[PDB]
Amino acid sequence: SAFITFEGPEGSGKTTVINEVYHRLVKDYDVIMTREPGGVPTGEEIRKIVLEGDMDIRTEAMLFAASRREHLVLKVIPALKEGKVVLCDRYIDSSLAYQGYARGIGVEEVRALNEFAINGLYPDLTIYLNVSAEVGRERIDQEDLKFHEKVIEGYQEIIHNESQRFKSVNADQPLENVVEDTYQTIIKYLEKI
């Protein structure tokens, strides 16, 4: 079993990449792909509160962490117990970069919150779709651009402090190459375990 998360800003091609990589991995592994809330009823009700939110950033961060726990308990943990490879589109690192860094709560504060939610369940491997701010901008106002750059800056601060868990993939390449590198990184990891 392996718990692999996918991370990146908007414009990294993350969702297109995970979809392709998953389609290729299904041919050789017992794998599922999910994201939060991912159909878990409580997480879906929490999602509705977030979308209906000038919500206080700490309340928003707690709602993401509550959804994360419900999705972890109902979907992720049972699949890992059945020996599956679990691919998850966004996890703890999205809260660290968005709520912690870009919104300014602080990465360390948001990490403490998320550690309460995940109760030790860190990913075995996190693929970071490393898109430059400029390529990201072109794939997508001043406020939206400032936020996008701050999300990228946050991910770089997180990856600098936890190098071993992450595998950075060049997301500035054509999408076919991003898919290939991510798939190869994953199979290299899965064949070692």
Ligand X SMILES: Cc1cn([C@H]2CCCN([C@H](CC(C)(C)C)c3ccc(C(=O)O)c(Oc4cccc(Br)c4)c3)C2)c(=O)[nH]c1=O
Annotated binding site for ATP: 8-15
Residues 67-86 contacting ligand X, CB under 6 A: 67
The residue within the footprint of a copy of itself, chosen from 27, 51, 119, 193 (CB under 8 A), is 119
Nearer to a copy of itself, 60 or 89 (CB): 60
Q: Where does this chain touch a copy of itself (CB under 8 A) — which range of 4-12, 107-115, 124-132, 161-169?
A: 107-115
Alpha-helical segments (H) within 106-174? 107-118, 133-139, 142-161
Query: Where is 166: in which H helix or E strand?
Result: strand 166-170
* Total residues at interface with a copy of itself (CB under 8 A): 25
Long-range CB pairs of 54-63, under 8 A, 24+ apart, other chains included: 57/99, 57/103, 57/104, 57/105, 58/105, 60/99, 60/103, 61/95, 61/99, 61/100, 61/103, 61/105, 61/110, 61/113, 62/113
- Of how many residues is the chain composed? 193
The answer to whether residue 65 forms part of the interface with a copy of itself (CB under 8 A) is yes
* Cα–Cα–Cα angle for 31, 35, 41, rounded to 5 degrees: 110
The answer to whether residue 125 forms part of the interface with a copy of itself (CB under 8 A) is no
The residue within the footprint of a copy of itself, chosen from 46, 80, 97, 127 (CB under 8 A), is 46
Q: Can you read off the two tokens belonging to residue 152?
A: 């990228």
Q: Which residue is nearest to ligand X (CB)?
A: 98
Binding site for ligand X (CB under 6 A): 36-37, 46-47, 50-51, 63-64, 67, 90, 94-95, 98-99
Binding site for a copy of itself (CB under 8 A): 41-42, 45-46, 49, 52-53, 55-56, 58-59, 61-63, 65-66, 69-70, 73, 109, 112-113, 116-117, 119
